């Protein structure tokens, strides 16, 4: 009479769990290397009626996996590549004076050196244009800025660094829960839950200050600061609309090739065709104003609505966070975005051209054990992108709930991964289970 507990199988159970993500893609590019398995055009989402699930942003380790997965790729792409250590020979230089726009003066140097031919016994004079950013004076003549740091390398310019979406799929017996709620706070339960066995691609693209090409917020601009009272935390900001940005590298770039050993081509910058001009970026002025108004409305959700909000010029620190940077067009750029923050907000022609800079020696991420040369790319660079959000920080020590101010900040790439990954969590399916029954086992 008394109930017997008995076996059932395949009953849904969720456990929070972590497994290694499986890479997949639509259909050489560094980001996919074409090694990711191609995947089916069948995003068969399953709405989960009557369920809710906790999701905690900044707790998911998919973010961490992505963060190190891309690093491993980056190194993998460079391990085949030729070392540039012959370039630590000191250089004679002059400031370039040929057709220089006045605000470009001293930006480039023409320099030369006694570096070796591919023959073991011979040397040749060599010269190239260089950005001033990539060199330091040998004494109060120049040397590459990284010769006192781990060695510079570069080869294999053919590989593309343009972003390609990357998809991640749960291992069999696991699934990816997602939250569709347009109002979702970075943490806690979500009523909108549905699931997929895999996810839509996410681009590897990075920025040091503003999110680029991210998914738009579903309803309204949103902010995810974690516990906002702690101002050491980065403030995520997600636009619910795109902001177009155009940029250029107006100089007509040309290329030179050098042999530094057998089989070892070395890229060098040819003289620019035409007048030298600064790299720049155009954004709508009006749109920038409008979207800031959307942002401050969001900020006020945590404050009295008559509070003062301010934006500011960057507080400095390392250039990689002091300025906005991107690899669009296959070449690195930096810009002075501080003009974008020259405003304050109170209760109650059509565009801007930001100045920019180019550095060819890239020290990736926070690492100091590696550096690489970026090859010149011939012609004018053009770039078009959608700005989809901001990485912001807030000054500590404010009082009387007013005059809060903000600056661009962060630059840990992990937060970029989070801007997309907050939508998902990985769970483990535990099909096994039991329940009481009126049944007792049959006689043998």
């Amino acid at each position: 009479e008394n109930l017997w507990v008995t076996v059932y199988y395949g009953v849904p159970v969720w456990k929070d769990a972590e497994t290694t993500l499986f890479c997949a893609s639509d259909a050489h590019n560094v980001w996919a290397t074409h090694a990711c398995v191609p995947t089916d055009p069948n995003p068969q989402e399953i709405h989960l009626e009557n369920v809710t699930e906790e999701f905690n942003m900044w707790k998911n380790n998919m973010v961490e996996q992505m963060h190190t997965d891309i690093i491993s790729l980056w190194d993998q792409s460079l391990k085949p590549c030729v070392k540039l250590t012959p370039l630590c020979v000191t250089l004679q230089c002059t400031n370039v004076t040929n057709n220089i726009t006045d605000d470009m003066r001293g930006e480039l140097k023409n320099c030369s050196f006694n570096m070796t031919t591919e023959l073991r016994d011979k040397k040749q004079k060599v010269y190239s244009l260089f950005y001033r950013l990539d060199v330091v004076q040998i004494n109060e003549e120049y040397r590459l800025i990284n010769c006192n740091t781990s060695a510079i390398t570069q080869a294999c310019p053919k590989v593309s660094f343009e972003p390609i979406p990357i998809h991640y799929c749960a291992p069999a017996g696991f699934a990816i829960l997602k939250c569709k709620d347009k109002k979702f706070n970075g943490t806690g339960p979500c009523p909108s839950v549905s699931t997929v066995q895999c996810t839509h691609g996410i681009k590897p693209v990075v920025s040091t200050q503003l999110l680029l090409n991210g998914s738009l917020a579903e309803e309204e601009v949103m902010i995810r600061s974690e516990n906002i009272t702690n101002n050491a935390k980065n403030i995520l900001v997600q636009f619910n609309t795109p902001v177009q940005i155009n940029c250029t590298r107006p100089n007509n770039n040309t290329r030179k090739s050098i042999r530094i050993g057998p089989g070892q081509a070395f890229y060098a910058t040819g003289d620019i065709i035409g007048d030298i001009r600064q790299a720049h970026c155009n954004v709508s002025k009006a749109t920038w104003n409008e979207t800031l108004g959307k942002v401050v409305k969001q900020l006020r959700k945590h404050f009295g609505n008559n509070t003062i909000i301010r934006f500011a010029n960057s507080s400095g620190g390392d250039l990689e966070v002091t300025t906005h940077s991107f690899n669009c067009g296959g070449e690195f750029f930096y810009c002075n975005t501080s003009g974008l923050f020259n405003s304050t907000w109170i209760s109650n022609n059509d565009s801007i051209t930001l100045p920019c800079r180019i550095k060819q020696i890239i020290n990736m991420w926070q690492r100091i054990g590696q550096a690489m040369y970026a090859p010149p790319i011939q012609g004018v660079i053009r770039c078009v992108s959608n700005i989809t959000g901001l990485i912001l920080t807030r000054d500590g020590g404010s009082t009387n709930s007013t005059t809060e101010t903000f600056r661009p900040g962060g630059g840990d790439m992990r937060d970029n991964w989070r801007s997309e990954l907050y939508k998902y969590k990985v769970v483990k399916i535990e099909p096994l289970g039991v329940a009481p029954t009126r049944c007792k086992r049959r006689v043998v």
């Epitope: 569709k180 347009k182 009523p191 309803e219």
Partner: antibody
């Protein structure tokens, strides 16, 4: 809010209704929705649009035949095609926030589909 | 998607009585449920949003309760002005995660005995 565009139309016709805002605008973000009600029957949701980005949601019977659009800072439209007698109804537009019902409604415009 | 079932379809109450109107959701919508009053020939009027919050200018004899799957509109002390049809409305969408106001219940007619 005031709806406009209703009247008598023949089966098979297309029609566009407009919802016009006065005293406020889409400088603030809202869901603007269309709801209909046939004579003697209940309220039937058609569609909502989030005015910040024109993202739209549709009833299963409306998507593919009705289209909601934000056409200005004070107007939202409902384009209707392949109308039948069963589409005869008062059409209302309404304004809601996120999660907080619809506090503002128009008086409705009457669409009659008949031979 | 989610179906909203409203009961009873009609109800009679004496002036001064209490009347309770129920609305069932087939999937949980937590608290995202609104209630409307409609007089013949008028557009509907918001009474309650988020299951129990009173809208501006609505008499205190209206109240709402419930959460998840089951909700109740209570009129405590019915008046002749309350003779109307009442609708619940789902205010959350499980597929998209968004909180726009969408599908209605079938409606309940309240007749008032004076």
């Amino acid at each position: 809010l005031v709806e406009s565009g209703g009247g008598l139309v023949q089966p098979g016709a297309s029609l566009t209704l407009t919802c016009t805002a006065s005293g406020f605008s889409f400088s603030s973000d809202y869901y603007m929705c269309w709801v209909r009600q046939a004579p003697g029957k209940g309220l039937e949701w058609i569609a909502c649009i989030w005015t910040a980005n024109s993202i739209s949601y549709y009833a299963r019977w409306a998507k593919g035949r009705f289209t909601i659009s934000k056409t200005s800072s004070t107007t939202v439209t409902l384009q209707m095609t392949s109308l039948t007698a069963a589409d005869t109804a008062t059409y209302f537009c309404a304004r809601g926030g996120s999660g907080d019902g619809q506090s503002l409604w128009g008086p409705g415009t009457l669409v009659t589909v008949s031979s | 998607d989610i179906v909203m079932t409203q009961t009873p379809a009609s109800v009679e109450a004496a002036v001064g009585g209490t009347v309770a109107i129920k609305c069932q959701a087939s999937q949980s919508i937590r608290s995202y449920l609104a209630w409307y009053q409609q007089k013949p020939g008028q557009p509907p009027k918001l009474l309650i949003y988020e299951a129990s919050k009173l809208a501006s200018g609505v008499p205190s004899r209206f109240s709402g309760s419930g959460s998840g799957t089951q909700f109740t509109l209570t009129i405590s002390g019915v008046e002749c002005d309350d003779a109307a049809t009442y609708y619940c409305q789902r205010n959350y969408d499980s597929y998209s995660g968004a909180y726009y106001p969408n599908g209605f219940g079938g409606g309940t007619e309240v007749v008032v005995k004076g």
